[PDB]
Amino acid sequence: MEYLIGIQGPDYVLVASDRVAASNIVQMKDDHDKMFKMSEKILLLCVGEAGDTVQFAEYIQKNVQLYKMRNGYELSPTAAANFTRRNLADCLRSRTPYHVNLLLAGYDEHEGPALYYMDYLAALAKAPFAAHGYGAFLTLSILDRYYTPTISRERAVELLRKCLEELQKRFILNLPTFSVRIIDKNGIHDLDNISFP
Amino acid sequence: MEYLIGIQGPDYVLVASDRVAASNIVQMKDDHDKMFKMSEKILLLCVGEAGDTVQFAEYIQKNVQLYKMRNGYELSPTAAANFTRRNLADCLRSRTPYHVNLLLAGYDEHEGPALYYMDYLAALAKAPFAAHGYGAFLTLSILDRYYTPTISRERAVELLRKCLEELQKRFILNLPTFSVRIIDKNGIHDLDNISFP
Amino acid sequence: MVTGTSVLGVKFEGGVVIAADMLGSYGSLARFRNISRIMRVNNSTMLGASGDYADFQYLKQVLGQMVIDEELLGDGHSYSPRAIHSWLTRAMYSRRSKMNPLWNTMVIGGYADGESFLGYVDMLGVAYEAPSLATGYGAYLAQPLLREVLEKQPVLSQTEARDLVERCMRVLYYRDARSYNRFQTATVTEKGVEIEGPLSTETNWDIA
Amino acid sequence: PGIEMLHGTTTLAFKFRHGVIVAADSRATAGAYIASQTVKKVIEINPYLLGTMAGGAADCSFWERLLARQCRIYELRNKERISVAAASKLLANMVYQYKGMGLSMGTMICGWDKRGPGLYYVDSEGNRISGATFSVGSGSVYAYGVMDRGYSYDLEVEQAYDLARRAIYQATYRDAYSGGAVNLYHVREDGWIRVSSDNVADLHEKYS
Amino acid sequence: PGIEMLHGTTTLAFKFRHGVIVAADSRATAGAYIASQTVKKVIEINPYLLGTMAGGAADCSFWERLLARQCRIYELRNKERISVAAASKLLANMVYQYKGMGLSMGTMICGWDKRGPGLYYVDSEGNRISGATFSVGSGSVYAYGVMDRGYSYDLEVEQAYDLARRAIYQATYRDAYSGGAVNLYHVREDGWIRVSSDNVADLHEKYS
Amino acid sequence: FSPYVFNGGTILAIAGEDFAIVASDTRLSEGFSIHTRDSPKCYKLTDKTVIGCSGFHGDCLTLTKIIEARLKMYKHSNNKAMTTGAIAAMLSTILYSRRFFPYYVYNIIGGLDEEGKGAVYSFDPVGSYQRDSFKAGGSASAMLQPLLDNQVGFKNMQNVEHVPLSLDRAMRLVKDVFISAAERDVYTGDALRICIVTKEGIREETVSLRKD
Amino acid sequence: IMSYNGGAVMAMKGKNCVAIAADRRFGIQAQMVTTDFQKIFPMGDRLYIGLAGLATDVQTVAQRLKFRLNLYELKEGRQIKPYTLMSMVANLLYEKRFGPYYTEPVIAGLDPKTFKPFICSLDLIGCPMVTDDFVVSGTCAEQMYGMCESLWEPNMDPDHLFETISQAMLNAVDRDAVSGMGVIVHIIEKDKITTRTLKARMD
Amino acid sequence: SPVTEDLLRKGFSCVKNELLPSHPLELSEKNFQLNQDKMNFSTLRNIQGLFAPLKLQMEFKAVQQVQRLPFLSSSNLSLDVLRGNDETIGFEDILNDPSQSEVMGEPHLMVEYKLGLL
Amino acid sequence: TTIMAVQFDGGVVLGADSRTTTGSYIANRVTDKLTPIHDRIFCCRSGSAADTQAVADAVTYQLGFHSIELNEPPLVHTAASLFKEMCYRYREDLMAGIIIAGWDPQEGGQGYSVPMGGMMVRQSFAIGGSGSSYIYGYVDATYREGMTKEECLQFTANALALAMERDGSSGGVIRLAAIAESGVERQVLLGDQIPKF
Amino acid sequence: AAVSVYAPPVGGFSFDNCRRNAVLEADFAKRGYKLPKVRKTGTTIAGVVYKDGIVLGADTRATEGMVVADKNCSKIHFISPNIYCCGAGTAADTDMTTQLISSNLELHSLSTGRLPRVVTANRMLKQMLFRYQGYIGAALVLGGVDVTGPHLYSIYPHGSTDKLPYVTMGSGSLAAMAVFEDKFRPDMEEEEAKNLVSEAIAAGIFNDLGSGSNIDLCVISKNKLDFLRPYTVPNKKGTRLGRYRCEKGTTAVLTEKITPLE
């Protein structure tokens, strides 16, 4: 299906993705950014059923800017997570058989980074490195093997590159290229795309 | 699923393939030759349900050598096709819900080459270039566009390379490398594998 | 789930005749044996129905109420049979579209303005007029004789029409699972509506 | 009832330095019987956009009509032309309002505006993917490969027209539902202009 | 009745310059209740081959027993050791004889013979794929990635042992059915030799 | 329970140069019996527009009774009469109003345009109009159409000129096609009603057809 | 089930002349894999058969019928009368009545002694019937009776017969998705066989 | 339910569906003469005594073993008037007549199988 | 389809109704639902319309063979045992409720019942049929003991005519037949001869 | 020949298609594809017993669904010199299941030297139809005079039998048999019986959809066997008004081959 991973660290919430589309037997577009943006410090990854993902992300994204614009300051990652989970649960149980997976991010100014894992029944954990899609099965062990509790930003990219090489070599599907974004205490930094010839 | 194509010509029955395995979400082996050999002049491509393909091909292959070894001479491609179709029909209707696709080949000494297309209900056509699997949908038009009625052996490889590049670029699955074999009036010649980095 | 048998009818030179069986079937058993199935809604229109019986009661009450209200108002106008037929068609179609069908099949006959009218109001929203008609299981046995006689002769008199209905009752009683010896009839000639019954059908089983 | 129309079809649209090109077939099938041969599918809503047709017929026509009404209302209100993205999102919301009741449609709203070209895609599923190369319907494949092989984003006008004609012809020769006529549409600063219409037989004769 | 045993498990085997190594867990579950902790899965059939276990339990044990009997008979008859390919094809034929009645098994017959090593794979589906790197069962994944990342075909003996231990431990830490003990098997010219057995708790303590 | 049942019928429409023709057989048949033999299936709407409605005969009446009422409403409101170019869209909207409970009808509209010109529309049960020139359809379709395709618009014929359809030819063709197609179909036959309409009004026509 | 492939065949009896025609197409549902796939078999010399339906059973029934025809021809000495093949195919189809085949064969030919044209037909499981004027069977069965009934005429010479069999197929088979793209016409006059290939819409 | 306790000669027959009867007119058509003979034998044994079925069945056995070898068509002129089907032509001889068998086995194999040696 | 039998001193009576049908439509107006097996034993029928005929034919075959083998008149218990053994062995697709009765030189006068399921038992009066459940009370309250032929015939006529009108399956003529010590005599009640109620 | 055969082949109804047929039908049912159909020729059949002999008759339309496949198909077969039968529904099965009994009775007659009796045909048909429990449907009307007297039978597709003096079987039969119920009287004459059966079959043909075209009668009196076909034409096709014939050169041509025979 798709692929979402995110590795924590001392002062970063680095996340990867998979710029790809879907159809019956065809790839409509080879570069479709799945990374919706909330604020200067918060990302929101989302993979799920077609249409419902881009609708729910848009609805939950044109609601956090309202809080900032109505109170001057900005939300915190914990509040954002505990709000997104509540909205997802209430809406899914209401009238819609949704299927969406989410992977929040964020870096506040009091307690390091924060990465949240959420399934499609609206649970909420705080794992130090999670995964989504089908590549999770083949890549989570690789992520767990080399994950020292403290990882430098330089080594995080290398670990991600190995974890994506293994997936690109041992997977049925044809994920051709991946995107990488890293969040620090300066905004939303960006890195060159990971493309396999 | 898989991929099988074969292009005719003046004096060749050139066929490609897809050296790959299958499982739930995993690729067990990346080089699995699907090209069973019948005689010094006949190939037999076969893609279908797991197990039944390698059983039916083995049974139909340890039956053509018997004819040669019992009569001195060798079968003809037309007889081989009209025998394989009969065996497939009788066995499939008997007690087994098979699902196998076949693509015969061969070069006799009286009427050029011969390429036969057979579905899973045991039909028999004589198309000048056929295809199997799912890549047939995305590649048959490409094969039909450039197919001059007469094609030199040099240009056949280039046409095949373009037809495989399009599939490797616009397909969901991850067919990593292909095999190529060309039959002439000298035996079963071989060519270097087609591998995409 | 009480059920009727057949409410067939044929047109006529100045009038209409309708016949029906006084029977009620509880699936297979003959639970009731004296219920009536003919109505006298006004001075120039009569009625007959088959299928379920409770729905027939309900439409009987509703239509009698409507006609009595219209007569009570007082304007020198009444309900021509065409209007009643249209109203029944609309009611049946509206009930069908709401997933609450009335398992019923009726015949409306009358004689107004020196001409005869006869219609079919099948529950699925079917409506038309014809020189002859049959309902329920009589659409295969009762119809052919009437159609043949009408094609041979398009206009009749009272004696042969009455005898034709008698013969149709004879054959239907011979070869139907749900039937009774007695049956009702009512003409709608310009004198008025005259309900007649019960009647009888003499049979012969000499080929036994 | 019976199958409505248009079990499948084909169309394509690519963008390059001189706008956006739209091509389509015309065969509105009804399962196994050809209903028509010259049904127009490139839907015009105003002289700036070009709605497309696929999937069902009546649903597509109705939703393009509603989109045209909304676009005209917005034009009259705000005195400024509406961008393609706004119309695409509007249609996406309207179609996504009803899901699971049997809706089926594929549309490729495209045109020129202040930001240049734009060829957003929306369907019954609800995604609003953009792109630079598209093809939808049953006959989208058998044309996808050829039109991807020929596309270069630096083509001329006549070369692009020939590419579109070749792609449609090769798609309809191998499929079993596309065919009939070929409509070719061009988009520029001054709105769309109809290029030409052609019959499959003549193209087959001249391409033989 | 109830679920028989062993809803899932894990195992792996890779080949290099010094033979073939086999590793396995021991937890024969019964759906949601742990039935045992020290059930041996590396099945011995003779001091040249090493049968494996996966899928069901009783079916696997019975078919390995039949394969062992056939191999012993062939040994006694032809005075020459049987190659691994012959045994693999024999088991493939026997298992493929019954299909669709609920058979489920994954075995990785391996050993040394006149042609060197060999690690053919067969299952209930019927394919007889070869290879140089394998892992079957529920916990095959979560170990596939690590054991593919570490494999180099030029390893030493202790390095290979450590790699196998790490792969099994990392697979069983993340899964929910594997665990218990770890059995490690080596193959050489003079037949297999048992390497060691270990408990998950000690490996977790020493790898922390 | 099943709120649907078949009733047969056949609709044919020729749109010539300055004349529209709509004709239809007349037989209400369901299951295996015959209900009647008159049952006309060609109703008039205005002085220059005729509607033919095949299909299930429980909605063929409701749509007929609704279209006239809406036409009266439009005439009272806008102080005019609907042309044949608007009735198509209006009926399409009504038909699509119940896309989740579709009407089981196959309607054909024929009439004159603003100027003297033939015009025949064609719908589908869900509701989607499309202009045509000789479109037919109904229960016993797929037999009427190919012969008209051969005759009206010369197709798959070479070295033959093009001649406009004359009025004398139209009825002679329609009668022949119905006579030919009545034998091999079960639901057709009985009486045939023709509603040829020109710029002087509507005139009827009834002929025998495989007497049954 | 006669939609997994395509096919359509006619037969008209003229004046000492019989014509049989078919359509060349073989494809798996929407897809198409070839344009040349014979559906007319030369059984005898002035006799022909017109199998049309699911192809995988067409081949088998043609092979079995050819085998049995060769056996009977060799054993009994002289040629086979056209009426005999009718009962031949009837028996062959009823052999598997419970496990039915998928074929609607058409037989058209001449008597080797009388030269009196003969045409028959068959249903799925074998029910002999003979029609004097014409007969047709295939996937697109509905859209040919209307085209054939009006255009037919008794006592037709070979030229008009060829024109009618061409016009009753060329513009009557394109009104369907499957079973198109090519038409073969076999005209069997008294002394010489003649084959023609028409051209139709390539869609 | 048997284990193994040449696949080219007899192959391509899955165990799945022989213990799953086809269209219900399968056991009443594959085994018809045997069932009719069994019913007649049971009736005679019940009503007439134990001698008649033994005598008749052993007569069947005596007359059965004088036909031609299995790899050739058997006339079966005798055993027919004794069976009782002397003129009862039916759906046993006009459909798929064994004389024109579409497939035929090897002579030695068929005769050795008829002997039951295999 | 009402069938009933009554036993008196020196013989028994037997009645039936001729309205065999096929649902809501009458198949045959007048039939003979009374088969004369041998010359004294009589066998009525119920249930289906073909299995009963086959069973009756087999019973006729076997019983005639037995009677001519022993050179003695048959005993009704033999017929009852034969019917039981035939019906019970095939208790899967042989839904045929049967009632048999007759006279024999030894203990003359017997009424046997054998309903669906193969069970066999004897009773003074036997009643069976789909429309044979509305007269249980009447027959229980009216049937005394010590009656001769005339009043037995009248009682059977009345009891059968009662159900003859309160059912849909029954209707038509009546087929009383009495088997006695000497011979068998039959008569039919038609028209007003049938008692009203 | 072959290398994978052990036992000699056995004749009879083959069954090596249902395994594929079931899965193919399951595949094609949910995809809305075409479905196979057979010539379910629902036709009216009438028979009456007059003073001397028997009179039979049936209509001659053979449909295969909603399309009129045939306009002239005999519904009356030959069994013996003085026995005739009729078919109704699934004509393919009824043709063979009547021809088989006809041949068996011919063999019996040749072996006996005397004319067959109807009860033998009834017994054989009943035995065969009950042996094939269902799965084969051919409603028959067996009638014929013999050495004893007139007879008639009404075999059903499950094995039931009757001995009515008149019978009407088939899809559309109620109209004709109601006409019989109204007009029939015992011990009629020949011409009156013919007129009555013609009128009943005409009512049945008019008031139904499964029947049409010509009718025929099969008077089988004691010393004269008659077979009138057709007897009466109730409906006649009209005439084509305009000529639509195409002349030479109308159609194109791509390739052409000419081969001369001898």
Compare all CA atoms of chain D with the CA of F6 and give the residue at the minimum distance: D1
Q: Tell me if F3 and C99 make a contact (CB, 8 A cut-off).
A: yes
d(CA G10, CA G37): 17
Query: First-to-last CA distance in chain J?
Result: 36
| From G33, G56, G60, residue closest to B127, measured CB to CB | G33
Express the helix, strand and coil content of chain C in percent, nearest 5 each: 35, 25, 40
Q: Tell me if G30 and D32 make a contact (CB, 8 A cut-off).
A: no
H/E segment holding residue A117: strand A116-118
Does I contact J via 3+ CB–CB distances below 8 Å?
Answer: yes
Extract the annotated binding site of D for bortezomib: 57
| From D127, D140, D141, residue closest to A54, measured CB to CB | D127
Is E57 annotated in a binding site? The answer is: yes
Residue C169: strand, helix, or coil: helix
Q: What per-residue string of b and e applies to J179-199 under the rule 16 or more CB within 10 Å gives b?
A: bbbeebeeebeeeebbebbbb
| From B94, B97, B121, residue closest to J16, measured CB to CB | B94
Q: Tell me if D5 and F4 make a contact (CB, 8 A cut-off).
A: no
Contacts of J206 (CB under 8 A, 6+ apart): C144, C147, C148, F212, J175, J234
Angstrom distances, CA of residue A114 to CA of A4, A47, A105: 16, 19, 6
Beta bridge partners of C117: C110
Q: Tell me if H96 and G95 make a contact (CB, 8 A cut-off).
A: yes
d(CA E60, CA E54): 7
d(CA B37, CA B64): 10
Min Cα–Cα distance to chain F from C39, Å: 24
Q: Tell me if D125 and A50 make a contact (CB, 8 A cut-off).
A: yes
Q: Tell me if J237 and F158 make a contact (CB, 8 A cut-off).
A: no
Longest dimension (CA), chain E: 54
Phi, psi of B77 (to 5 degrees): -55, -40
d(CA C63, CA A171): 75
H/E segment holding residue D71: helix D58-78
- In this complex, the chains that touch C, judged by 3 or more CB pairs closer than 8 A, are F, I, J
Q: Tell me if H89 and J103 make a contact (CB, 8 A cut-off).
A: yes
- In this complex, the chains that touch F, judged by 3 or more CB pairs closer than 8 A, are C, D, G, J
Interfacial B residues in 42-61 facing H (CB < 8 Å) = 56, 59
Q: Tell me if A138 and B25 make a contact (CB, 8 A cut-off).
A: yes
d(CA I194, CA I161): 7
- Residues of chain B positioned with their CB less than 8 A from the CB of D170: 141, 144-145
CB atoms within 10 A of CB D127: 22
Q: Tell me if A27 and B172 make a contact (CB, 8 A cut-off).
A: yes
Q: Tell me if A145 and E141 make a contact (CB, 8 A cut-off).
A: no
Residue C175: strand, helix, or coil: coil
d(CA H17, CA H24): 14
Active site residues of E: 9
CB atoms within 10 A of CB B22: 16
Q: Tell me if H43 and I62 make a contact (CB, 8 A cut-off).
A: yes
Cα within 13 Å of Cα(D171), Cβ side: 36
H/E segment holding residue I184: strand I184-186
Give strand ranges (E) for J87-203.
Answer: 142-143, 152-153, 166-169
Angstrom distances, CA of residue C41 to CA of C46, C47, C86, D199: 6, 7, 15, 67
Active site residues of D: 9
* Catalytic residue of the set J43, J44, J90, J98: J43
Phi, psi of H25 (to 5 degrees): -85, 55
Q: Does C205 touch chain I (CB under 8 A)?
A: yes
- Residues of chain F positioned with their CB less than 8 A from the CB of G200: 156
d(CA J238, CA F176): 9
d(CA A28, CA D119): 13
- Residues of chain C positioned with their CB less than 8 A from the CB of F33: 139-140, 143
User: Please, what is the angle between helix A135-146 and helix E157-174, to 10°?
Assistant: 120
Query: Strand pairing of B100-104 and B116-118?
Result: antiparallel
Min Cα–Cα distance to chain J from D47, Å: 40
d(CA C71, CA C78): 7
Q: Does H48 touch chain I (CB under 8 A)?
A: yes
Query: First-to-last CA distance in chain C?
Result: 35
Q: Does F174 touch chain G (CB under 8 A)?
A: no
- Under a CB-based contact definition with an 8 Å cutoff, are residues F120 and F71 in contact? no
H helices, E strands: number in chain I: 4, 9
Give strand ranges (E) for F67-203.
Answer: 105-112, 118-122, 137-138, 190-194, 197-198, 201-202
- Residues of chain J positioned with their CB less than 8 A from the CB of C143: 175, 207
Angle (CA) G156 G157 G163, round 5°: 85
- Under a CB-based contact definition with an 8 Å cutoff, are residues E101 and E113 in contact? no
d(CA F46, CA F82): 8
**DSSP string for residues in I120-159:** -EE-SEEEESTT-SSSHHHHHHH--S---HHHHHHHHHHH
d(CA I99, CA I42): 9
Compare all CA atoms of chain J with the CA of C168 and give the residue at the minimum distance: J182
Q: Is F64 exposed, middle or buried (0-12, 13-18, 19+ CB in 10 A)?
A: middle
Torsion angle, alpha carbons of J187, J191, J193, J196, to 10? -140
d(CA B104, CA B57): 11
Min Cα–Cα distance to chain C from I164, Å: 11
- Residues of chain H positioned with their CB less than 8 A from the CB of I65: 47-48
d(CA C51, CA C73): 33
| From G26, G31, G54, residue closest to B125, measured CB to CB | G26
Q: Nominal resolution in Å?
A: 3.9
Q: Does A83 touch chain B (CB under 8 A)?
A: no
From J209, D123, I4, J250, select the one nearest F159 (Cα to Cα): J250
- Residues of chain D positioned with their CB less than 8 A from the CB of A21: 129
Q: Is G32 exposed, middle or buried (0-12, 13-18, 19+ CB in 10 A)?
A: buried
- Mutation target vs E (from A5, A139, A140, A141; most E CBs, 10 A cutoff): A141
Q: Does H3 touch chain E (CB under 8 A)?
A: yes
From D202, B64, G93, select the one nearest J38 (Cα to Cα): G93
Long-range CB contact pairs, I74-78, < 8 A, 24+: I74/I38, I74/I40, I74/I41, I74/I104, I75/I104, I75/I106, I76/I41, I76/I100, I76/I101, I76/I102, I76/I103, I76/I104, I76/I110, I76/I112, I77/I110
Q: Does D100 touch chain F (CB under 8 A)?
A: no
- Under a CB-based contact definition with an 8 Å cutoff, are residues C197 and C184 in contact? yes
- In this complex, the chains that touch E, judged by 3 or more CB pairs closer than 8 A, are A, B, H
**What tokens appear for J71 in the block?**
């306009």
Catalytic residue flag (residue I142): no
Min Cα–Cα distance to chain D from J132, Å: 37
- In this complex, the chains that touch B, judged by 3 or more CB pairs closer than 8 A, are A, D, E, G, H, J
Compare all CA atoms of chain C with the CA of F37 and give the residue at the minimum distance: C130
Long-range CB contact pairs, C201-206, < 8 A, 24+: C201/C166, C201/C169, C201/C170, C201/C173, C203/C170, C203/C173, C203/C174, C203/I191, C204/I191, C205/I29, C205/I30, C205/I172, C205/I173, C205/I190, C205/I191, C206/J186
Residue F50: strand, helix, or coil: strand
- Mutation target vs D (from B141, B145, B165; most D CBs, 10 A cutoff): B141
Q: Does E125 touch chain B (CB under 8 A)?
A: yes
Q: Tell me if J39 and G123 make a contact (CB, 8 A cut-off).
A: yes
d(CA C92, CA A160): 71
Q: Tell me if G177 and D177 make a contact (CB, 8 A cut-off).
A: yes
Q: Tell me if C128 and F3 make a contact (CB, 8 A cut-off).
A: no
- Under a CB-based contact definition with an 8 Å cutoff, are residues F153 and F133 in contact? yes
**What tokens appear for I141 in the block?**
């309250």
CB atoms within 10 A of CB G111: 15
**What tokens appear for A145 in the block?**
């093997």
